[PDB]
Amino acid sequence: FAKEIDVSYVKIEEVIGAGEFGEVCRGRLKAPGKKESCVAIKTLTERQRREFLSEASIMGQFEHPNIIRLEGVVTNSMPVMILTEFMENGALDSFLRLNDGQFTVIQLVGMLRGIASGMRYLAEMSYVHRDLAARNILVNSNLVCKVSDFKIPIRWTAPEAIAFRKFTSASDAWSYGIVMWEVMSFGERPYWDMSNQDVINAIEQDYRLPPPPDCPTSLHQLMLDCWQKDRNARPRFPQVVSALDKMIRNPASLK
Numbered sequence: 365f366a367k368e369i370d371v372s373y374v375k376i377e378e379v380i381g382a383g384e385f386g387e388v389c390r391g392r393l394k395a396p397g398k399k400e401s402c403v404a405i406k407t408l409t410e411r412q413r414r415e416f417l418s419e420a421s422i423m424g425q426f427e428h429p430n431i432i433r434l435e436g437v438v439t440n441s442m443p444v445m446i447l448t449e450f451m452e453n454g455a456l457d458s459f460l461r462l463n464d465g466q467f468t469v470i471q472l473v474g475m476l477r478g479i480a481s482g483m484r485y486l487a488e489m490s491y492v493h494r495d496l497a498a499r500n501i502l503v504n505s506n507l508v509c510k511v512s513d514f515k516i517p518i519r520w521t522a523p524e525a526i527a528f529r530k531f532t533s534a535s536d537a538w539s540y541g542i543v544m545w546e547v548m549s550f551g552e553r554p555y556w557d558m559s560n561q562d563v564i565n566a567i568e569q570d571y572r573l574p575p576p577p578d579c580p581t582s583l584h585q586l587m588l589d590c591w592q593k594d595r596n597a598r599p600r601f602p603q604v605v606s607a608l609d610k611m612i613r614n615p616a617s618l619k
C-alpha cells in the first residue's frame with residue numbers, strides 16, 4: 365500500500381470504540397523527520413483482510429479538509445491497522461446530542477457547509493458515498509466536520525436507491541438533506557418513532573420531515589429541495605454549497 369508505515373512508529377493508547385473487524389484506539393504516530401501526530405487506529409479470512417484494508421485504498425485517493433485523512437496503514441505485519449487523523453469530538457450525531465441547542469444557527473450552517481464541501485469534492489471525483497449520515501461524520505476541536513466511513517440505511521436513502529439498489533451523487537444529495545435535518549435537530553434520529561417500513565410508506569405518500577425546532581425556513585426549504593422525488597430536480601453539491609454560502613453572507617436569513 366501507500367501510506368504504508370512501520371508499526372514501530374505507532375503508539376496505541378486508549379481503546380475508544382468497537383469496530384466491525386475489531387478494536388479502535390486513540391494513539392500517536394511518530395514518523396522520523398515529521399512531527400508526532402494524533403491518530404485513531406483501527407486494528408484487524410483473506411477476504412476480511414482485503415475488505416478491512418479497502419477503506420484505506422479508497423480513503424488514500426482523497427485529500428480535502430472535510431474528508432477524513434489517511435495518515436497510514438500497516439499491512440506488512442499483525443495486527444493489520446488503519447490510521448486516520450484524530451478527531452477529538454467524535455461522531456457528529458452524538459456530539460450534537462451532547463450540545464443540544466448550544467451552537468448558533470451560524471455555527472451549525474458552518475458545519476453543514478463543511479460537509480457539503482466534502483461531498484462536492486466526492487461527487488467531483490465521481491465517488492458515491494451511499495451511507496452519508498451524521499453518525500458517519502467526525503468532528504474536531506475546531507468544529508470542522510469530516511466525512512468518514514469509506515443492509516441499506518433506509519431512513520438516509522433516496523426512494524429510487526431503495527427501489528433499484530443503485531446509488532448516485534443525486535441519491536447522496538437526498539442523504540445530505542437528512543443530514544441537514546439531523547444537524548438542525550441536534551442529533552435526533554430521522555423519523556424518530558417510525559419503523560423502516562413506516563418511513564418508506566411515508567415517503568411514497570410524499571411525507572417529508574418537518575422543520576426542526578428553531579430552524580430557519582431557508583434551511584428547511586433546502587432540505588425539501590434535496591428531497592425532491594425527481595433526483596434530477598435535486599440541487600447538485602456545488603449548488604448546495606452556494607445556497608449555504610448565501611445564507612452565511614446574509615445571516616438575517618438565519619434568524
Ligand SMILES: COc1ccc(Nc2ncnc(Nc3cc(OC)c(OC)c(OC)c3)n2)cc1Cl
Nearest residue numbers: 380381382383388404448449450451452454455
Ligand atoms: C467504530 O468505532 C469507531 C470507528 C471509527 C473511528 N474513527 C475515527 N477516526 C478519526 N477520529 C476518530 N475520533 C473519534 C471517534 C469516536 O467515535 C466515532 C469517538 O467517540 C468514541 C471519539 O471520542 C474521542 C473520537 N475516530 C472511531 C471509532 Cl470509535
